[PDB]
Design a protein around this ligand. Sequence first.
Ligand SMILES: NCC(=O)NS(=O)(=O)OC[C@H]1O[C@@H](n2cnc3c(N)ncnc32)[C@H](O)[C@@H]1O
Ligand SMILES: NCC(=O)NS(=O)(=O)OC[C@H]1O[C@@H](n2cnc3c(N)ncnc32)[C@H](O)[C@@H]1O
Ligand SMILES: [Cl-]
Ligand SMILES: [Cl-]
Ligand SMILES: [Zn+2]
Lengths: 77, 75, 295, 296
Amino acid sequence: HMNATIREILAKFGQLPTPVDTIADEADLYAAGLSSFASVQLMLGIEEAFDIEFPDNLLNRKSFASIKAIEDTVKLI
Amino acid sequence: MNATIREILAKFGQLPTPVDTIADEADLYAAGLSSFASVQLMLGIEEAFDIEFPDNLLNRKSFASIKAIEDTVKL
Amino acid sequence: DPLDHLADKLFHSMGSDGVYARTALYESIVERLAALITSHREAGTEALRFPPVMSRAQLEKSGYLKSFPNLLGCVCGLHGTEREINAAVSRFDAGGDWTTSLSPADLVLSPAACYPVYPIAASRGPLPKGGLRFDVAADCFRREPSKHLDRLQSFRMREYVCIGTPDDVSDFRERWMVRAQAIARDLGLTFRVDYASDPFFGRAGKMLANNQRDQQLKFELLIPLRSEEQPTACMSFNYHREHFGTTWGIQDANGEPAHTGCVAFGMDRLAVAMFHTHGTDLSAWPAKVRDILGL
Amino acid sequence: ADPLDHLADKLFHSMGSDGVYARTALYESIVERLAALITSHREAGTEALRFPPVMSRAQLEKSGYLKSFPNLLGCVCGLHGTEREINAAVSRFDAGGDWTTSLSPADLVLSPAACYPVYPIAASRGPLPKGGLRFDVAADCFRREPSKHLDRLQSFRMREYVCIGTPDDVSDFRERWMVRAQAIARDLGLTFRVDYASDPFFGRAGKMLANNQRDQQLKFELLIPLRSEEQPTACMSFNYHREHFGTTWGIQDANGEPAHTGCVAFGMDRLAVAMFHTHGTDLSAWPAKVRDILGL
Ligand SMILES: NCC(=O)NS(=O)(=O)OC[C@H]1O[C@@H](n2cnc3c(N)ncnc32)[C@H](O)[C@@H]1O
Ligand SMILES: NCC(=O)NS(=O)(=O)OC[C@H]1O[C@@H](n2cnc3c(N)ncnc32)[C@H](O)[C@@H]1O
Ligand SMILES: [Cl-]
Ligand SMILES: [Cl-]
Ligand SMILES: [Zn+2]
């Protein structure tokens, strides 16, 4: 379920060209078309949908490189 | 006329001496009436009476003395 | 408009009337004009350079709101907390209006170069005999959008200011009325000088302008740019009597409230006048003008 | 106390506002020599533009300044109402109240950095030529951050060289300038180091942008000890924006891809202050080589 939530947010804020249905768990979101500003909205979108807040240690490109990276990060939090 | 002018000149004139000391013929400028006070005074004459000066009589001369003001009003 | 053809070589659009990017050609002439004015600076003059903003409190105290409130640019910002600010920004993203969250700072855009000099003069105590003389400059602002190249919202002003007795200022005034004309002549410019008035605001402003004109407190050097019937004021001399001396508590050497006066150079108007008069090809400028400017 | 404080007497006069000062002839002569020194190092084929202290609010909004530094922005507001309304606002001021309640926003802001207006100008020219475009820009800039420290001003002069082109055009430009700027700083007898850094992006979202900027080394600063050797002051910056502004403004490089941009920025007031902090306020006592470099 956590997986699909993240996916809806990625369509909410992500500003990607190809649909989230057309993106695998371990896939390059930045190559896919995730911009800097977008990745920040996405991060805020994640924070809103899961009512959580990231540590500054994970407030970076790495944590949001892929849905799997996102899922693992949210889980590890 | 002098009834209402000594009230305004005291209100907006911002002079060192009180309005009950000016001789109704003496120079208000040598008394201490600054430029910006003088315009607040002009504006006070247009609010206590229902009239606006023409830009012709709208000047230093029309506000030199208290008698200068009063005369201007009738015209 | 006759000046419009100059824009191509002098300016680039910045998406706002009266606010332009300056080309290297344009700036090279502004700089030479500034150096020329400096070469005529009189003895004993203290040079100060002001930023494009000044204290709102100082300007309020100067009386600017009683004269030109409609021309003032105030600095405002988003002063709230992170959530408040984020809310405003969010409204912008949403299509709403973030500017509703703006509140005034303690700063305004300077309307003229001389205002900051009066409290500085006052802080030094009574004036010496002979008074004080200042050379001031600032980027000034006036809220009057226009497409005419001689009517800008942001423009450079250069001023020589005299603070002293009535005789000091009158002597300074006579000198600068002569020198300003001699500068314009050396620059090959055509002009006349006439008395005029500042654009005071409102009905009270009508009396003020009348008094200023009647008392000859303001002279302008006027250059035909778009027409001879509507010339452009490119230099002025302003006599303030004791207005600023009283406002700021400046005492002359006799213990009386100081008089002040200044000669003002509109650097952007003079530059535009040079290009309108002499063209955008510097190599063809009259030899005497080139020599005068050190080209 | 701040080691810089004692400089104030020779360099500045108070204007009744922290971070806003009048400049003395002494100070201005050094700002001017520093500007001429920077100009003497300009690369061939660089177009010089000078900007006023205000720019279009619509242009600044579009550049994304509100999502990044909303807290630093200075907007221009004015009394846009009727004569009656304006007179009333003035009358409230005479009666102990606040005239500023009658203000409304203009279409202008005070410029926060000198480069912003250059991007639409470049965009208006069509596709970039091969090698891209380079600009020499300057403006009096504003950032709403009051401080009593002489190295932290609200109104200050910025000088920049800007490159707009392919990723390679821009990264080589930045490397050329990082070397050249350090050589200039050494010629000026300044002590410094160059470290990577990040802009002060605002809020939670800003911590992430700041993290990525640092991680990707998009911003170097040349740092000079003024107040302390532990908290040195950034007096120049070397910035890489990738395609952010090329994308925003629809700028296309000669290959038809969204252009990259970068800039080298000189904080003129910080550099001047650094010179006076480093060599003192008597110019005849400056090292002969420094005087020579500056044409004194
Ligand atoms: N304290 C002395 C003074 O302020 N005086 S004055 O208010 O009269 O403007 C000084 C000078 O600034 C120039 N100037 C004024 N307004 C503009 C404008 N909108 N665009 C371009 N240049 C301008 C013009 O050359 C004028 O003579
Ligand atoms: N466009 C590229 C850029 O903006 N880059 S940067 O934002 O990094 O600032 C450019 C430079 O302006 C100087 N500077 C910045 N803020 C201040 C301030 N408050 N007071 C004095 N100097 C300052 C400082 O030297 C800094 O390196
Ligand atoms: Cl001007
Ligand atoms: Cl600076
Ligand atoms: Zn820049």
